[PDB]
Amino acid sequence: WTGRQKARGAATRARQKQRASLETMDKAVQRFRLQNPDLDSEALLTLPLLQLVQKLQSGELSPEAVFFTYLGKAWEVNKGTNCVTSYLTDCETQLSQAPRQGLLYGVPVSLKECFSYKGHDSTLGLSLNEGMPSESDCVVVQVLKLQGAVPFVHTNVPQSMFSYDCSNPLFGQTMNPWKSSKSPGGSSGGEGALIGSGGSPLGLGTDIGGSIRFPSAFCGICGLKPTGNRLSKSGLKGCVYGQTAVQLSLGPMARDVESLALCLKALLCEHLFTLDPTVPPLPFREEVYRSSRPLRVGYYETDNYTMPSPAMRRALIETKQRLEAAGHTLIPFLPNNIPYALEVLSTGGLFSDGGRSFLQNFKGDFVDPCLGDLILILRLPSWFKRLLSLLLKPLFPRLAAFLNNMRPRSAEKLWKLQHEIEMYRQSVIAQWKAMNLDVLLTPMLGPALDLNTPGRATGAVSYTMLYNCLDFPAGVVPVTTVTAEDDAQMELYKGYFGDIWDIILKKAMKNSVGLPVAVQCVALPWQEELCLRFMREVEQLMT
Template sequence: MKLFGLPVSLKECIGVKGMDSTIGYSSLINKPALEDSVIVKVLKSCGAVPFVKTNLVQGMLNFESSNPIFGKTGNPKNVNYTPGGSSSGAGSLVGSGGSVLGFGTDIAGSIRNPAHLCGVCGLKPTMQRLSKIGLQGSLPGQSCLSSCVGPLAQDVDTLVLAMQALSCPLMSQLDKNIPPLPFNDELFQSKLKLRIGYYTNDGYAEPVPAVQRAVLMTKEILEKAGHTLVPFKVPRIEDAMRILSSALFADGGKTCMENLKNDLVDPVNRYLYWRLSCPAFLRPIVKYVVGWGSPRIAKDLMVYGGGDRSVYRLWKIQAETEKYKKEFFTQWQDLDLSAVICPPFPIAAAPIGSVEHTTALTSYCALFNLLNCPCGVIPVTKVSQADTDKLKDHKGNYGDKWDNHNKKVNENSTDMPVGVQFVGLPWMDEICLRLMKEVETQILLQKHES
């Protein structure tokens, strides 16, 4: 019982017998789960003590944290700043010391984003390392972007402990989709020097200076440890963003709109709601007008809502997904990489309510849901005054409204946490955790010496 007596927090969507999982929708109030979800059953079998459910954003498709039932959640470093989302309560509670170990879910960065913004550690495992049976989802049936359950903690050792405990026979006995794959301690403990790719800008959303600096800091730490770091370029990033947005809303936004039709729309979801509800006949007109200022935003608008919802279109999206994955992993293989480091998010924490849900915010996380890569985030640094000063020259890759948004929201983010994302090949979760631990150890040593 590796987790004996350990208090564990659970994202509100994770099923616990006798408790609601509303995901911020009033229509799901007073509909308690009839039994524990598989992840809760396994946690209890490991000796863990689930003690609280944590807040999330309405519908779990936003990087803010608010819903009409439970209200807002603040960042543990500054309660007036967003903790990110959608596993916002998990990031905030762990970051404030209220929970040693929390569990969230991640479909486009919902674990890694709050880990980055709250200054904690988080892991999005390979899909089907941990069971999702018994969870309330926002887009049931959607399978192109892999949704995962994963842990958040104050240090990497606790993430490792959680994955060691949960990679047990009971998980695959209760959920036949989960392979009986034990945690690979040999891979995690390996001292073999690795070849690692890195990038600070994916070409879609240029991160603010603090986020780029964090990646370069991590690159330097890994090089000093004897690893080889080589530049990596994300292939066809605009196509990747079109594919993943198309996959996420292949139903034309119908599922989201059905959930919201008799409910209050939380203010943080207004922009998403507008994109999904805009009538099909109006979209070409809006696209034409918006296109004068940003072709990128105009193209994105046509992906959300309305239009063709046929099985034929869905199959085309799935075929494009497989083609893109082959291209991406061929490039990875050609460079002989074991892992990649990159930003987890283009911005640092910003004031609550200031972060619009734009596609430009999703590229660094959602890409790896599309690819089903395991990814982890650890805190590396904080936004410095020098980082903030550099914002005045920050233009972004397109110089459009989305780039200006990312610049503006971080104008007062000095001293907020900044994380780095570690990415491995599918089923190589232990390599991510190994590198996260190595970098974490060196950062702690540097702090001690200073």
């Protein structure tokens, strides 16, 4: 498996598809703009989604108008960002079908590429998934459609969706719309760049280690990673199936938190619960989302794993003080044994099989630089990860731990690990209740890392991963931008470890003046309405 002819073929074919898609969308927007030269696009594109939806519903704006305008903006912003991989087949026929009663009637929505769509590849940037169009829409696509929405594009993801950058050898590299040298985050990076530049009012990403939250934060939009099984993962393309220790979660990304709520409200209905009975039929509880009661807000300023950027620290402290000023009680709170949850529970849950199932997707394929040495490392034999870990342990403990916990195990040892994760979850919940929290405020990784560094700043996944591991709903909302003061203070940054993960992060978070910085909001499992209520408060008080 060292021949690349197939991979090269797939790369050419994918590029011609994306070039063709982009042409197609160009022709359509020109045809439209000719017929509608008086349309005020800028007014329409800057409409918050709630107001867009109401005008759609009132009939004040036709779907054609909002669609081809957004399509227009998507094509335009894509020139600078390369976030659109495909234009979704007969979304224009869907445009004129969109159920008029649908809660998202006439709303264009962007999809991360793994959200399978009839007649389209979900390549994941992998060559073996090229030329394999899905035979039907995934469940959440079906409901979006049923609920009046118009999925219109597939947005780029990093190869295999297992980097928090966003390049792949098929469609290339997606860029942060705020600064071309920066990453848009990932794996939902296409979404981040698109929505964060005004090209889509609402998109859907996925998140198993922070992949909704990284791009949302890096690109200065909001996003929510619900409880794993709050929404249906049916029809989603991934590259490892049956790993249940760390739940893959999917969720909404959007310009305001109201949009996230609307999207959940829309998705959580009889259509979804019918199409996928394995999802618990938990309707969106608006009264909880709309509550304006005080909150007991747990907070931490650092997780003692990934030292926060000065920007993050300030962002956290500032939203803390504003929340306090708004009459909420802020309690110092840090989930126990984060190192354990990250180094053994998370890494071991994600790589229970040494990474072998994951590695299968790369046979014959190029490995994108933004994955870093991940593939090289997973490919190392079990005994050598062991040996290396023990040699590294006295010197570089985080790396030792990482190597040591990504080895193959028996089903017997997997059961043991899942049980530790199960109890770990219950340990943090006890902590939570003992402290009587409603909700939890935390740092979000930020600002945007430089453009090939996420795959080498491996430790920085800590702020988000922890809640994948706990399967707590966690969302992210921008609250500030990097001041020069914050940027200069990066020179005084030396992480908690001084290993190359810290060194690469240190470098990667420099030259970031003006970029958005976010804060993370966490609630207990099944409490996405509560979580959004908190996010809405944060958003309000910082915006």
